[PDB]
Design an enzyme around this catalytic site. Structure first.
Site, short mmCIF file in Angstrom:
data_model
loop_
_atom_site.label_atom_id
_atom_site.label_comp_id
_atom_site.label_asym_id
_atom_site.label_seq_id
_atom_site.Cartn_x
_atom_site.Cartn_y
_atom_site.Cartn_z
N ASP A 31 95.00 39.10 -102.24
CA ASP A 31 93.86 38.85 -101.37
C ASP A 31 94.12 37.95 -100.14
O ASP A 31 93.90 36.74 -100.19
CB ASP A 31 92.75 38.24 -102.23
CG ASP A 31 91.43 38.28 -101.55
OD1 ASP A 31 91.09 39.33 -100.95
OD2 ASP A 31 90.66 37.30 -101.55
N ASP A 74 91.74 41.82 -94.36
CA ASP A 74 91.49 41.41 -95.73
C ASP A 74 91.88 42.49 -96.74
O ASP A 74 91.29 43.57 -96.81
CB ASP A 74 90.01 41.07 -95.84
CG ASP A 74 89.62 40.55 -97.18
OD1 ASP A 74 90.43 40.58 -98.13
OD2 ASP A 74 88.48 40.09 -97.38
C1 LIG Z 1 81.96 46.49 -100.13
C2 LIG Z 1 81.12 47.08 -101.25
C3 LIG Z 1 80.38 48.29 -100.72
C4 LIG Z 1 82.04 47.46 -102.37
C5 LIG Z 1 82.46 46.19 -103.07
O1 LIG Z 1 81.57 45.43 -103.44
N1 LIG Z 1 83.84 45.74 -102.99
C6 LIG Z 1 84.18 44.37 -103.28
C7 LIG Z 1 84.38 43.70 -101.91
O2 LIG Z 1 85.15 44.17 -101.07
N2 LIG Z 1 83.93 42.36 -101.69
C8 LIG Z 1 84.45 41.66 -100.54
C9 LIG Z 1 84.95 40.34 -101.08
O3 LIG Z 1 84.15 39.53 -101.55
N3 LIG Z 1 86.36 40.09 -101.11
C10 LIG Z 1 86.85 38.83 -101.64
C11 LIG Z 1 87.69 38.11 -100.57
O4 LIG Z 1 88.80 38.87 -100.12
C12 LIG Z 1 86.81 37.73 -99.38
C13 LIG Z 1 86.07 36.48 -99.80
O5 LIG Z 1 84.91 36.58 -100.18
N4 LIG Z 1 86.74 35.19 -99.74
C14 LIG Z 1 86.04 34.02 -100.19
C15 LIG Z 1 87.01 32.85 -100.24
C16 LIG Z 1 84.90 33.74 -99.22
O6 LIG Z 1 85.11 33.87 -98.02
N5 LIG Z 1 83.72 33.09 -99.75
C17 LIG Z 1 82.66 32.50 -98.94
C18 LIG Z 1 82.68 30.97 -99.06
O7 LIG Z 1 82.76 30.61 -100.43
C19 LIG Z 1 83.85 30.27 -98.38
C20 LIG Z 1 83.47 29.65 -97.05
O8 LIG Z 1 82.36 29.92 -96.51
O9 LIG Z 1 84.32 28.88 -96.51
C21 LIG Z 1 81.35 33.11 -99.46
F1 LIG Z 1 81.34 33.06 -100.77
F2 LIG Z 1 81.20 34.37 -99.08
F3 LIG Z 1 80.31 32.46 -99.03
C22 LIG Z 1 87.55 39.11 -102.97
F4 LIG Z 1 88.45 40.07 -102.85
F5 LIG Z 1 86.63 39.55 -103.77
F6 LIG Z 1 88.06 38.00 -103.48
C23 LIG Z 1 83.42 41.45 -99.44
C24 LIG Z 1 82.86 42.75 -98.87
C25 LIG Z 1 83.99 40.57 -98.34
C26 LIG Z 1 85.44 44.29 -104.14
C27 LIG Z 1 85.25 44.79 -105.55
C28 LIG Z 1 85.99 42.87 -104.21
#
Ligand SMILES: CC(C)CC(=O)N[C@H](C(=O)N[C@H](C(=O)N[C@H]([C@@H](O)CC(=O)N[C@@H](C)C(=O)N[C@H]([C@@H](O)CC(=O)O)C(F)(F)F)C(F)(F)F)C(C)C)C(C)C
Ligand SMILES: CC(C)CC(=O)N[C@H](C(=O)N[C@H](C(=O)N[C@H]([C@@H](O)CC(=O)N[C@@H](C)C(=O)N[C@H]([C@@H](O)CC(=O)O)C(F)(F)F)C(F)(F)F)C(C)C)C(C)C
Lengths: 329, 329
Positions: A34, A214
């Protein structure tokens, strides 16, 4: 070759996974790799969720190099949350190894029903330290400090369903993976692998947009209003309650993403970003473009982009490289 | 009739809306009337955000009865976030009216794509005081404490698209709506409209399960482990990373939900949680069920439930009353 190759398995042309160990003994796990995040987590044995009950669980008392910590941390993503405490131990990828600080997971209900549905065990981040929780210097950056790798860089060559497997490479660029020139784009922030790109789709244009690249996103993400402007010239079915859409996979009126900069022109055709749902109807697809607002208007070039574009992530040079992937290894 | 009604308009088979107005002039709005939250909010004329373009907005200046306040707030929903500050002024529902503290929203950006996609202006909470941000007495409690209706209670008769409109009634029970006996279940807590019922679905039995009755939840919400055991052998398809479950409408293997207590038995049969997706494929349906996990095992009996059952929400007598809704008025 002379680098550290970690093999990648396809899920359906939607996601990919790859294995790593934790602890000096075996203890094998299946990971979401990731660039999207910068923590490592792993499902504990002390975990009594319905979710972990199907996963490969982690045993901290059966690895000679464990090191207690137990600080509580809530790890949140866009797609859900996961809870537990910190720990330290030997993380092993390809055939390289190091002591590392990772998260031991005791609650997974925040990530359901996706966790139990999917085959992965945990999530291994690959972002920058400012994105980490508990300031953890990225593995690759540490494997350079311990002069284990040539360069502080890693490379993603993603599998396609009926063609080939893929690799995550640590330490250097291999020519076998790509054809054509690499184009390096500079990070606008040392947070996400984020670069600045003009995004345009038919007429809808957004100059100088934030683009997070990503590996752990199954869609292309798009500013919420941007999607509306796009939807206006399509003829797709809305899924009643959800922000999802359905088309024939051969609808000619489907848009190509065009991202352009001073250095490169990268396009993404429908045939890469659509999500095939053959088992619901013949030649039927989910649009797989998702509305998602950040503080700044932002596009996540996720899995689909990465299936076409071979990509270099360069810590030394604060950059992302982009080239056409080889159709065949 | 003796008590005040509000007509409920069907939102494309999906949601339903009602009108309330704010200020000493009228200034009408369209609200989601919603037992699952306990704040009233309305978009400001001072609003800056894109979402607000298509919406009815509130002008302090135009209303004699306005009362400055301005403490910043942030309202939080499983489905998004909305931000502003408090104001006091003349809420009117049907035609009962009272000075009421509410939120004047000025940033809706954390509420996309839902807010621009849907045609409601505000949300109107009908849950309990502890659910609220800022300790606000429910409208229907105040209306009673001030003696404007006989009982501190409101009722829900949901519309059905092809057949009838719907009514939110305040202050009394109306025979014209239901059929057969009402049955009453004490709340287990004065937070959501939450009773304890035995949830039984296949041979899966969850005993003593918390159930929230939520007129603003478009689906029926099940614990993720329960729902995963439930799908198991039915010929349903979970689209890989979506809460998108698809079947034949005639799938003769689909279970009836059955909730029970000392006093009553509540079934919800496939014809109630299935939405026709003809445009996607012939004879196809989707299951209007989400998988959600609260801290304690919970079900949410949202609109699907209430489409079958007339519901009575009694603050005085701390309970929910359920009887089969009339087919046609
Ligand atoms: C897109 C859908 C139609 C399908 C589906 O749900 N796919 C999922 C998806 O891609 N989810 C992504 C995701 O959360 N990916 C994730 C990360 O690559 C990105 C991330 O959220 N990173 C965290 C660290 C994040 O940015 N969190 C932030 C904050 O915690 C951090 C901040 O603001 O500084 C959030 F919670 F969103 F608020 C994964 F892989 F799950 F870990 C989303 C669309 C961005 C996968 C099964 C994981
Ligand atoms: C999920 C699919 C079925 C599609 C979908 O998005 N449906 C929507 C829906 O039903 N959303 C539900 C929901 O958010 N309902 C909402 C409420 O009924 C419950 C609420 O969030 N209540 C609040 C008060 C709550 O529990 N907040 C808590 C806390 O923050 C506590 C706090 O501070 O208030 C939460 F945010 F969940 F974290 C609605 F109506 F939006 F207001 C969701 C499935 C649970 C509608 C078509 C708009």
């Amino acid at each position: 070759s002379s680098n550290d190759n970690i093999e990648l398995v396809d899920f359906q042309n939607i996601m990919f996974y790859g294995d790593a160990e934790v602890g000096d003994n075996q203890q094998p796990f299946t990971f979401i790799l990731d660039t999207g995040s910068a923590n490592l987590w792993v499902p504990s044995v002390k975990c009594t969720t319905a979710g972990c009950l199907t996963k490969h669980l982690y045993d901290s008392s059966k690895s000679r190099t464990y090191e207690k910590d137990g600080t509580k941390v809530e790890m949140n993503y866009v797609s859900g949350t996961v809870s537990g405490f910190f720990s330290k131990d030997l993380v092993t990828v390809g055939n390289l190894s190091l002591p590392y600080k990772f998260i031991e997971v005791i609650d997974t209900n925040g990530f359901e029903p996706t966790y139990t549905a999917s085959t992965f065990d945990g999530i291994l981040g690959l972002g920058w330290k400012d994105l980490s929780i508990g300031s953890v210097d990225p593995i690759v950056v540490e494997l350079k400090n311990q002069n284990k790798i040539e360069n502080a860089l890693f490379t993603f060559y993603l599998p396609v369903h009926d063609k080939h497997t893929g690799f995550l490479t640590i330490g250097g660029i291999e020519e076998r993976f790509y054809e054509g020139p690499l184009t390096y784009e500079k990070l606008n922030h040392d947070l996400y692998w984020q670069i600045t790109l003009d995004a345009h789709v038919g007429n809808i244009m957004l100059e100088k947009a934030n683009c997070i690249v990503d590996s752990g996103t199954s869609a292309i993400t798009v500013p919420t209003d941007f999607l509306n402007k796009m939807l206006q010239n399509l003829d797709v079915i809305k899924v009643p309650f959800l922000p999802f859409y359905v088309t024939l996979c051969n609808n000619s009126k489907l848009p190509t993403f065009e991202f352009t900069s001073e250095n490169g022109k990268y396009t993404l055709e429908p045939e890469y970003y659509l999500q095939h749902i053959e088992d619901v109807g013949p030649g039927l697809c989910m649009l797989n473009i998702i509305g998602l607002d950040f503080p700044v208007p932002t596009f996540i070039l996720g899995d689909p982009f990465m299936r076409k574009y071979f990509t270099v992530f360069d810590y030394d040079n604060h950059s992302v490289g982009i080239a056409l992937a080889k159709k065949n290894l």
